[PDB]
Design a binder for this molecule. Sequence first.
Ligand SMILES: *C(=O)[C@H](C)SCCNC(=O)CCNC(=O)[C@H](O)C(C)(C)COP(=O)(O)OP(=O)(O)OC[C@H]1O[C@@H](n2cnc3c(N)ncnc32)[C@H](O)[C@@H]1OP(=O)(O)O
Ligand SMILES: [Mg+2]
Lengths: 6, 170
Amino acid sequence: VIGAKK
Amino acid sequence: KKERVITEFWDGKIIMVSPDDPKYALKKAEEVRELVDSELGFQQVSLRCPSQTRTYMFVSNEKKIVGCLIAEPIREAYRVLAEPPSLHRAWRCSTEPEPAICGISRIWVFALMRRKAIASRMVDAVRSSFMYGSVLTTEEIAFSDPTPDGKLFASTYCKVPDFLVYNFVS
Ligand SMILES: *C(=O)[C@H](C)SCCNC(=O)CCNC(=O)[C@H](O)C(C)(C)COP(=O)(O)OP(=O)(O)OC[C@H]1O[C@@H](n2cnc3c(N)ncnc32)[C@H](O)[C@@H]1OP(=O)(O)O
Ligand SMILES: [Mg+2]
């Protein structure tokens, strides 16, 4: 999981 | 300066800036985004055109912008799940997506004015104004990659632990 925040 | 007032309160008012508002509004929206991104600890932010977003601001009786919410249209989102504890903060989500309309891309309240229902009223304003002639339910909004503060807020606001999340990869 990357995520547009962390 | 024409101003789009969504809701008015004893302690301030919520306004909205649209992608086709005058430059002065779009700069103020940008200044506020810059502060938020910085507050969240980002050095650089390279994303798609803000022409998708709508920016809601809570304006105090002293004309200070103390709350900000940036909304964007979305199609689907994922129920958040607590990370299983280790034997000796993060989150996960379900694999099946659910339909959603409004994604809350950024939400911020000046720290000395937190726990005064500002964020709750900003989401309320969004649910009533994001889509013409409709009031979104709590099951039709999602939050991007929530911070710990975001989780605590969203789980209370949505009244469930498994509120909708978006903006992630695998
Ligand atoms: C990515 O950006 C995602 C969109 S998540 C980003 C969330 N924003 C931040 O992390 C920036 C720094 N923090 C904030 O800006 C604020 O904490 C929030 C915007 C998360 C919440 O703002 P506000 O403080 O105005 O919320 P409400 O008064 O409306 O809260 C309603 C209920 O939610 C629970 N809760 C809210 N905030 C809580 C925090 N720090 N800690 C524990 N619980 C929190 C409370 O139940 C609160 O209701 P009460 O009656 O006050 O208890
Ligand atoms: Mg409480």
